Amino acid sequence: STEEFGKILLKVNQDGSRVLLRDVAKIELGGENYDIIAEFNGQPASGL
Amino acid sequence: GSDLGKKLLEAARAGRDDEVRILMANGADVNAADVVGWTPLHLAAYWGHLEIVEVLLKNGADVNAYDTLGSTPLHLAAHFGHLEIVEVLLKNGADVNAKDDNGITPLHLAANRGHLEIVEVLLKYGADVNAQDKFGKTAFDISINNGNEDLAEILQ
Amino acid sequence: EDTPQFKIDIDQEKAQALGVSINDINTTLGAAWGGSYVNDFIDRGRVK
């Protein structure tokens, strides 16, 4: 899940404050690529 | 152990209410434990078998029985989001502040999986909100790390 | 059927705080308890 990836500990600062991956990046479930986008009669579609 | 002790461990895990019923009548050892130290109540609590949990407690099952790593049935029920079983165990005198070998409590495990209803029930039965594990982490420290803003508010 | 298995969680914060790398931890656990195939040697003219 995005939650588990979000709480990946990158480093602990000198004072003990934690830098998680969600502090340096937005984490979502998205496509391998964003190149190919299909429509069937104008409406959203995928296919093979 | 005994022959019937094994069948009760299997029946309790499987969720076979009728078989547990007959085994309780025949006098199957409720304190029967496998190699890792899991009683029938441990298994029933883990897999979320409510009726068997209640039947076992009626037949004098140790509500505060712990495995070889010091974890109790309330730890299991609270961790895997079994609200009804957590309430039943706590009504039958389950230690709400039970610590395993890691210093982890039922509140820590409930907070980790974001079981809000269960966390409230544990706090209702006097769960030590300031209780720390071996790494000095509370149920609140888990909520902010997990990013559960609903849970973090309850624990104040 | 499902069997009881020994789940162990490495505390990432404690490892980083003590200056202990996760590769060294997972190698130590894996190599010791699981066994590790390092490389090949030649026993009486046969690679093993």
UniProtKB/Swiss-Prot annotation, chain C:
Annotated S-S bridges: none
Induction: Positively regulated by MarA, Rob and SoxS transcriptional regulators (at protein level).
Subcellular location: Cell inner membrane
Recorded phenotype for the gene knockout or disruption: Loss of susceptibility to contact-dependent growth inhibition (CDI); inhibiting cells still contact the target.
Subunit structure comment from the entry: Homotrimer, with large domains that extend into the periplasm, interacts with AcrA and TolC. AcrA may be required to stably link this protein and TolC. Interacts with AcrZ. Part of the AcrA-AcrB-AcrZ-TolC efflux pump.
Function: AcrA-AcrB-AcrZ-TolC is a drug efflux protein complex with broad substrate specificity that uses the proton motive force to export substrates.
Assigned protein family: Belongs to the resistance-nodulation-cell division (RND) (TC 2.A.6) family.
Name of the featured protein: Multidrug efflux pump subunit AcrB
Species in which this protein is naturally found: Escherichia coli (strain K12)
